[PDB]
Amino acid sequence: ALGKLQDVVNHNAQALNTLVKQLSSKFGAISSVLNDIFSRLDPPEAEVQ
Amino acid sequence: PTYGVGHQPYRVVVLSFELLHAPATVCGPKKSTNLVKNKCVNFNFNGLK
Amino acid sequence: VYAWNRKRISNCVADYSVLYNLAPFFTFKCYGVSPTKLNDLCFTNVYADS
Amino acid sequence: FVIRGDEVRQIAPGQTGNIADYNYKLPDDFTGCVIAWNSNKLDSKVSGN
């Protein structure tokens, strides 16, 4: 019955759920947490990775 | 005995680690402090900063 | 290289800044970590070799 | 300065050793160059410590 009203809510919910699950995805680094690269590498490699 | 510079051998050690969620055993020499509860502070719990 | 010497060490407080006065030409090519940064991280287990 | 040995090669941005710590150090930019030469026959001093 209320199909077109739940669609926008589900879209706005999945847009927020998919935006927070991509923070655990490494884009080419050795870790995902912010306080992991600045605690194991040197600045010349930290400012790169 | 009187061989070339490049011909001399080299004792090489390739010791490696494994940084993950398992309880760490080998760590650097540091100290510890008390633990506050209802206070926004900085923490360095077992590497997790 | 024919027979490795793998000694899986246990928990300790070994300071990695001890071999900084080793024999001449002591290269430190850490591919993944930093040499001077090995003083605050808590490693799980170290796998040595010889 | 008259620093000598392989620690001359160790003189670089970072790469803290046993001599490069309390001998000479630059900020973490090194916007310049570093010349070095072997003064074997130039400054050969036995008791000129």
From Swiss-Prot, chain A:
Q: Which residues form a coiled coil?
A: 6-49
- Note the superkingdom of the native organism: Viruses
Q: What is the effect of changing residue 7 to N?
A: In strain: Delta/B.1.617.2, Mu/B.1.621
Function according to Swiss-Prot or TrEMBL: Subunit of the fusion protein that is processed upon entry into the host cell. Mediates fusion of the virion and cellular membranes by functioning as a class I viral fusion protein. Contains a viral fusion peptide that is unmasked after S2 cleavage. This cleavage can occur at the cell membrane by host TMPRSS2 or during endocytosis by host CSTL. In either case, this triggers an extensive and irreversible conformational change that leads to fusion of the viral envelope with the cellular cytoplasmic membrane, releasing viral genomic RNA into the host cell cytoplasm.
Of the parent protein, the shown chain spans 944 to 992 of 1273
What lineage does the source organism belong to?
Answer: Viruses, Riboviria, Orthornavirae, Pisuviricota, Pisoniviricetes
This one is known as Spike protein S2'
